[PDB]
Amino acid sequence: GRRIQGQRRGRGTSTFRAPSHRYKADLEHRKVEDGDVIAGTVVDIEHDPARSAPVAAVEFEDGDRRLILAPEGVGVGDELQVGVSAEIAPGNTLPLAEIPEGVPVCNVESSPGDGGKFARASGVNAQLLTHDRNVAVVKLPSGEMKRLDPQCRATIGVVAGGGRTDKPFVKAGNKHHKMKARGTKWPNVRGVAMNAVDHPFGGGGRQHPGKPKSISRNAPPGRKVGDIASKRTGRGG
Amino acid sequence: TGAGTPSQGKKNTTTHTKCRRCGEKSYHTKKKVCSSCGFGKSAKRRDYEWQSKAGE
Amino acid sequence: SSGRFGARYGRVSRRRVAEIESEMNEDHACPNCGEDRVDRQGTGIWQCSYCDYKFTGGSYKPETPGGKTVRRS
RNA sequence: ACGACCGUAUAGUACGAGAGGAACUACGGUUGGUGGCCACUGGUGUACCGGUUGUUCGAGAGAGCACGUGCCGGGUAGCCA
């Protein structure tokens, strides 16, 4: 047949790419040697085209203008501290060791000094639970207990822009606009509505899949469609 | 709209032009490559064995 | 508050937008003073017309039930 | 290039207990077809006359354009049913 849509994706053509040239900043944490004497004042609160959540413009003590991931409640004029012995205030970045247990945290690092990987979407938060000299157990937004290094930096508080998923898109045009700002080809034509040549579920006199939808993990790209390695399907049982 | 006569009216783009190297009207001014001699693509001149019959 | 949607879309599509836009253009308290002058600027961006305080909050709410949990600890 | 039907007189008669109910013939009309014709009725009639909207020639008068008459009203000859 012909290569399926998921195969055209990896080629990285214009249609499947993200409008990077229209994106503001790659939100990473500031690189401090040691100490704490790094503080800044929030100049502006901007809209980030990349994640739909707001982003805070901060100017530091050493005169560095960089955008940072905005938590809830952080406004213009406010002072945020970054360092080891930073004040345990919402919006401050300090390693997981220094942050007390049972406190909601965002922009958590994987390997210490990477700039933040986990809990970065609108209104989400990671929960810090257990402490040790070796490990800091953080409960990520998916409900998974991630065992992390205590030297991994994290910003205190939940991410701003919460409850975005609550209000519906209502009309196709609103989805259109959102998708034109992301790295996604939209709209989605069902495989079952295509020809046999185009997709494993294409063909027939009526629209139904050919074989069962639950595909094996070992399936090759071109065949791996539908329910990928499903442990189960349905709602009941 | 027909793919024939009414689609011919839009054809006012200039692509293939006289080539600096070989003199043929094959220099694609958008690709900056010559379709005849390979100017812009290769230092060597575009020649292929299929430009003639196998035993010639 | 979704009369712009007309006779289209349905109950839930205009009820969950009516409860969102009635608690958005509403008078909410400000963190710098005691004024109810908090209006929206965009997605997640809020501002008070009093002391020019431009802040961060939820997308449609200036404070989410999750943002109030941080104030505790 | 004529086909067929209805009606009147025959006759409430022949026939028949009654109920019911003919024909020959003589008439009048209708229908279908056919050929022709336009006094009459009807249609057309961008011949013609009138009314009138818009705009242009200054107004008036008198006109052009509005699809092959702007629109409305009347309509001779002829051609027609």
Place this chain on the structure above:
RNA sequence: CGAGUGGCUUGCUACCUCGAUGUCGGUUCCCUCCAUCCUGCCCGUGCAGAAGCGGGCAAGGGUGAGGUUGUUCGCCUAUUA
């Protein structure tokens, strides 16, 4: 039960056409056949009459309008000689 005629139904066959003989129904326009529905002339009757039933000669003329359905076919309505 037996003997046939037709070539309108269906079937059979594979002769003709696959370097193409344009489909069904309908329509329009022309000719024809008779195994006659009406009309003309007749014979019989379980022919009083009236209305019929059956049959004979006969193809001059006629055999129309509509409702459902693409329908052919058919069902249905009101007229009709």
Place this chain on the structure above:
RNA sequence: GUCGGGUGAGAACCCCGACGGCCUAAUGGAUAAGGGUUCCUCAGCACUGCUGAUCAGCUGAGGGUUAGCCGGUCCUAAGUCUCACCGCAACUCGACUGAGACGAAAUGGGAAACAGGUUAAUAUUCCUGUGCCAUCAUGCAGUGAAAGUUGACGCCCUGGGGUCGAUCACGCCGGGCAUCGCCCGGUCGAACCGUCCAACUCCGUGGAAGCCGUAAUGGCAGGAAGCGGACGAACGGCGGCAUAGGGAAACGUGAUUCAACCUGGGGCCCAUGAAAAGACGAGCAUGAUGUCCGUACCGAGAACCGACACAGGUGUCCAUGGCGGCGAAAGCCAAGGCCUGUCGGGAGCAACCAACGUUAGGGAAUUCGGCAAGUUAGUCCCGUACCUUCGGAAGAAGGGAUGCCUGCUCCGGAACGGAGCAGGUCGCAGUGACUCGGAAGCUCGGACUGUCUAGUAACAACAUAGGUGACCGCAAAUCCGCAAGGACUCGUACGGUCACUGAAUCCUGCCCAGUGCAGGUAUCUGAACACCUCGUACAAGAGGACGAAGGACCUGUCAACGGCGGGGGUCUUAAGGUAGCGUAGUACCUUGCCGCAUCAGUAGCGGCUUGCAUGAAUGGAUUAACCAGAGCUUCACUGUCCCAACGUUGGGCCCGGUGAACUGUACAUUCCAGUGCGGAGUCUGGAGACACCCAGGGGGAAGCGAAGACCCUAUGGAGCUUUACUGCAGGCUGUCGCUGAGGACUCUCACUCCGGGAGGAGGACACCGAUAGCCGGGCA
């Protein structure tokens, strides 16, 4: 187009005048692309031109494009290339990372020019006048100098300032008309230099406890109004420019509405709306320099693309010319353009055809079907049902009004703006043309806007929001590459990948036996390496031991593929069809039966419904709104019909000129029968038949057009499917190499990743190379 005239050997179409027309977002003006000399002059008619030609985009020969300040040039955009690096058997190949370059001529950014005159042809380029910018030199000033500002920015609504234009008032200049005294044109004057400043912001004063303010939002003791002030706009006003220019002349003044331009206020986003060079910041004189490339003409029913002087296609600016009216609408008319959407002459001009007007009475009887046509129509007033998601339905439906003239009232600063009143008055008709909905009901489908088969399908198909399931913590899941590498990703579960269903509302039953996916697994089965036995002086080879994934086996799972019957008062194979819906776009029987409606209804609708073979995200039901979607009914309307007629315009017919093509074995005046490979102008027998030509509608030449798409055949082809055959990628898994120290474990030194670095995480694993087993229509 016509009548005159001009030139010419020759004139319907070349030129002049007159008369008559056509074009108004174009048939006018300026341009982009593209063309390429097509531009101008002179001379021509062999070619080209739908006829002719004295003409020409044709032939030939000459000539024509002038820039510091208009573009290019410079800058950076999506992105492209080059070099280096790495991959590759290799390259003219290939991703990343660096560096450099390229990348905008209408239409991104940008130092600077206006007015007039001039040519056969150029013109912000030449000439006259005036002006401006940059660099440099000198002189004076200046020590400031780089922080900041600008370049520089979305969509929607809106205020204020304001020019051109248009119109009104009045005056002057010129023209027109002549029953009036009305009508038309003009009344000019730039860049630049100087100056003025509304809005916004801010400061002083002030002292509001209810005031200030707006079209609207709004503002304030954290200091309102009022008062003074700093900052600060136009392509605008004002003055100069200008005893410049231009005009035959006059060579105006005020006003309203105000495109351009200037400057503010508000609202929206699960959408957030370039960058860089450059400029400003940061003076003035005088002098010098300001090179290079483009510059003609067309820009289209003849200069472009479409083989053509092609009814097609082709971007931008003029969107403010007048009446009209809501209007960038119609219709009419200026300025400007044109009579080249380029053959003519003749016939009351027949038939027949294309477009079209009007048709009495009837009124869908026409037809598969109201197809075609028609009806309705603008504006105001009154009035408006079922149903509904409360938005809508709705312009429902239905009724009335509508001109002109005289004199007025109201709103507003006013309009040459709007709303009304009284009286008079004309027509068949007052939205008098033009412009301008026919209306109502039942049903099916899809919710809706949207998408689609460029060229027979616009739909019920695709999309959609919404619903749902699946995979993944990021050194991820998913995907691309042979590799070096890469998309997703300036992303992180409120994410984004992979699928299904398809708004809302009410719901979504039962089945895990088969198949699929996933988890588990005592035991069984399970390859190679290493190891053990036999064998061989070695080797081939045979057997054993251990045993990964996988399988067996067990479990989970159906909004996973799918299933939901036969028999009787269980059987296959797990269950045995629940809500609903139902003769369905699904019902064979079938025009099912009853009812509605009609004279008559295989239609349509309601009910029943044992459903050949309905049914729950293979989603069931339902539904307001929407629809160039399918079906039906009513009112209205009508040449669709009864049944056709007359007319109009272009053809058709005759004449001049121009001038193809299809097709052609031959013969050929046929007709009725027959015969023949059973469908004959040509054979047989008869009949008929004097030749030629014009017009016609198409009976025949099994007419012309296409080596039939139907069907079969060929050890033909291709696309597609799968538990067809055989293989190939890919995934999983064992083993060997990299690979190191001390049947479970510790370590650090290779190697990997994170960190700028210090250093941190991981670690002999992972990656990579090799081999083995399993899965493997993803591909051949």
Place this chain on the structure above:
RNA sequence: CGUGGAAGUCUGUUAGAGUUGGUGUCCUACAAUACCCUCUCGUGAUCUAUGUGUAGGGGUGAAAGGCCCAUCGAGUCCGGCA
């Protein structure tokens, strides 16, 4: 009651986009997809110019096996090839 002016909102041959019916005209065409009337959308998932990217078992595809220069159930050219 007014103000406000929302909208994949309505009427609309505004510009512009599209293409339902006539199964009209044409069908050796004006035209190898044209003409006329009728019809649909017309502030948005809108339309459009120029520049730029994706390439052949590959693109692109709101999916019609649509489109990739009159060429598509695998473009075109030349070669294999007689």
